[PDB]
Amino acid sequence: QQEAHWTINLKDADIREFIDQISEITGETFVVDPRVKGQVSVVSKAQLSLSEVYQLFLSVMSTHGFTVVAQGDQARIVPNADRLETRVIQVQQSPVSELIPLIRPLVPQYGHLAAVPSANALIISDRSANIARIEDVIRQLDQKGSHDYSVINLRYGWVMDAAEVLNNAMSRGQAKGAAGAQVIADARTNRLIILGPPQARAKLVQLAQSLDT
Amino acid sequence: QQEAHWTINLKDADIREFIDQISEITGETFVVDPRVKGQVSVVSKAQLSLSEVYQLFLSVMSTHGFTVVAQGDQARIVPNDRLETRVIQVQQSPVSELIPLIRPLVPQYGHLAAVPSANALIISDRSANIARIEDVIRQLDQKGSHDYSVINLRYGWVMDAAEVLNNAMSRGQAKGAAGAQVIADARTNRLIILGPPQARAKLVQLAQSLDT
């Protein structure tokens, strides 16, 4: 009996190099189609089981526009008819499920986000600059006990403005009992996510609903 | 110039029959691998554009375990059981508003995704659960506001906590919180609070006090 857990750290390396690492990990030989090309950035500081490794492999394949098909009782890598980095961030002081609704709004159309519940981590696809930002958001989000939130679907306003309005109101103390509460803007769906301790969070909801006129 | 919108109604028909309907719609010839077999149930009461049709095709392919590849300079269907696929159009609010509210009633064996262009959603589940979810959406759509609050129960049990709140509202024991609703997500052990602002805020206070 022997069970291993892997940490992957590949930056700007070839796609065929990552597939090579994966096959050496999983023990599965893949047939790489000649048109398979590209440079991938894959980092996982969290130690992954065999399944969690495979999960991360398919994620990287989908992110870079390829798919795994079963031809002649072996896996074949063919394309599914910009450079995106991939990071596996482990949540330590709460279950991942709690964070997904909160970081999902900072993820674009080109980017992807999915949980690895077994590892209590999440896989993210985005640009190098946005990934360092989202990683920083997670890092700050993990500390808290409560991850209870409120959603405001704006109609009379514009989310980017409405949030800039609220953050200015909190900083100057013009927002009554709002010290310690956060605002997340989802431009895609035009909605606000309200966070922080119960008393504070409730006051921000009243404040933001009054701003929709 | 000429543009079309299709409505598909295929129940218990062969996979190769649906692929045939799709190719006749899209105008793209697909090469089916011999191992591709199965009976599919696909219904869309909402009229779909070419793109929205293709979206629905790939969804059905993923749901039944196949994938589309550009192999040999043509599109090929290769592999990546009582499932149905329905396209439900939301009439009053944008789909984005109702996805967080119905998503908890969707299992692992299923899948839910929005067609924002058609303001509809594609769901894969069993025939019995799909009829249930379809009438949940049909009831949820009527309202104006779909703003909501989430309570992550860290002590109690969601099924109980919700039954507790619904009883408190019916008898009027829940103060200034009329016309509000509670959604239970057992998987994540959390409560979703809905309804008019004033009412919804009172229920949040009521449900947070119940977590001890």
Numbering used by the authors:
A (entry chain B): 48 to 128, 142 to 273
B (entry chain A): 48 to 127, 142 to 273
Show passages lifted from the paper.
In Pseudomonas aeruginosa, the Xcp T2SS plays an important role in bacterial virulence by its capacity to deliver a large panel of toxins and degradative enzymes into the surrounding environment. Secretins are large homooligomeric assemblies of 12 to 16 monomers forming a distinctive bipartite ring-shaped and cylindrical structure on their C- and N-terminal sides, respectively. The periplasmic N domain of secretins is constituted by the succession of structurally independent subdomains labeled N0 to N3 (7–9). Here, we revealed that the N-terminal domain of the T2SS secretin XcpQ from Pseudomonas aeruginosa is able to self-assemble into a hexamer of dimers independently of its C-terminal domain.
To gain deeper structural information on XcpQN012 multimerization, we endeavored to determine the 3D structure of the purified recombinant XcpQN012 by X-ray crystallography. The overall structure of the XpQN012 monomer, refined at 3.0-Å resolution, showed a typical organization into three subdomains, N0, N1, and N2, where each subdomain abuts the next in an N0:N1:N2 arrangement in three dimensions. The crystal structure revealed an axial dimeric association of XcpQN012 organized in face-to-face fashion. The dimer packing is stabilized by the interaction between N0-N0* and N2-N2* subdomains from each monomer (the “*” corresponds to the second molecule in the dimer). The dimerization seems to be driven by the N2-N2* contact with a buried surface of 600 Å2 that represents about 60% of the total buried surface. Most of the contacts between N2 subdomains are localized within the β9 strand interacting with the β9* in the facing N2* subdomain, creating a continuous 6-stranded antiparallel β-sheet. In contrast to XcpQN012, the N2 subdomain of GspD is not in contact with the N1 subdomain. This difference results in a high root mean square deviation (RMSD) (4.36 Å) when the two structures are superimposed. However, a slight difference was observed between the packing of the two XcpQ dimers, due to a general displacement of monomer B toward monomer A. This leads, in the present study, to a more compact dimer with a larger buried surface area of 1,040 Å2 compared to 880 Å2 for the previous structure.
